[PDB]
Each structure stands twice: as C-alpha cells, then as structure tokens.
C-alpha cells in the first residue's frame, strides 16, 4: 500500500511516496483517487541516459 502524500506529522508533512519499485514478470497496479493525482509511470532498467 502506498499513500501518495504521506502526512507523518500531525500538523502535516507534505512529501511524496514514489519509490523505484521492481518490475518482475509484470505488475498489477490499482489506484484509488478523486482528483487525478496519478499521472503515469516510467519503465526501464537503469532509468538514466
């Protein structure tokens, strides 16, 4: 489970949660949202030039 804007502090923290996850034999991605914050994905091996 990945909460997008993790609010660690009670007053509020405003940091994203987008770890570089592995891609082994395919993945199943499900998103629950209400204001279209999920915008896509990037795929590759080293994610560089």
């Amino acid at each position, epitope marked *: 489970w990945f909460h997008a804007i993790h609010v660690s502090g009670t007053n509020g923290t405003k940091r994203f949660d987008n770890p570089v996850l592995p891609f082994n034999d395919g993945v199943y991605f499900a998103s629950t949202e209400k204001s*279209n914050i999920i915008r*896509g994905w990037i795929f590759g091996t080293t994610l560089d030039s």
Partner: nanobody
Amino acid sequence: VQLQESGGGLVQPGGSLRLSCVASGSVTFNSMGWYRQAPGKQRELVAQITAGGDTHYADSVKGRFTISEHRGKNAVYLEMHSLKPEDTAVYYCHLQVPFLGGGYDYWGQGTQVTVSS
C-alpha cells in the same frame, strides 16, 4: 489493437457518403469524434459527439454534416453531404476511451475517402 475501424469509399463532388466509425463491440467513451488529414496538412477536427449529446462542428462543416449514434449497434454514424474535393483526406476516428482520466484515442486506424470528379 482492440477497436477496429473501416468504411467509406471514393466519391465525386456533389455526392453524399454515410460513413461510419464502425466499431467491433460495445465500448465506453465520453466524446466520440472524427478527424481528417490530407498529405502535407495537419489533422483538422470535423465533428464531435459526446455521451451527453453535444455536437461540435468545425467552421467548414456546418450546414452539411450530421452525426447520429446507434447504441443498439454501439456505432456512431458519420454522414457527409454536399461533398467537395477539399474533403479528401486520411479520415481518423479519435476515441474517448478513458485512460488516466481520458485519452489514448484510436484514430490511427483510419479510412480512405477521396472526393474527386
């Protein structure tokens, strides 16, 4: 792949073709539309039909073009009239299948309709 598109044929000026963006099955979309594209020219909008029923027309197409949806056969129908040679183009069927909030139209599979005497 999924959606498969075809229809139409070569005609002469003054004729009318009832082309359809014939689909392959029941589909979900919010604004179905049809494009054109001539060689050396960019794609230009022709008509727009939404789920609600809004019908958007380009400047060069009012007074001659009608759009009707057939939900029984799940296909919109694209009927031209008063055809002129300027309408010859690589006709496209951009779709409104939702994708990350809408997108990924299927206009790549087009039809070839040429208007000439």
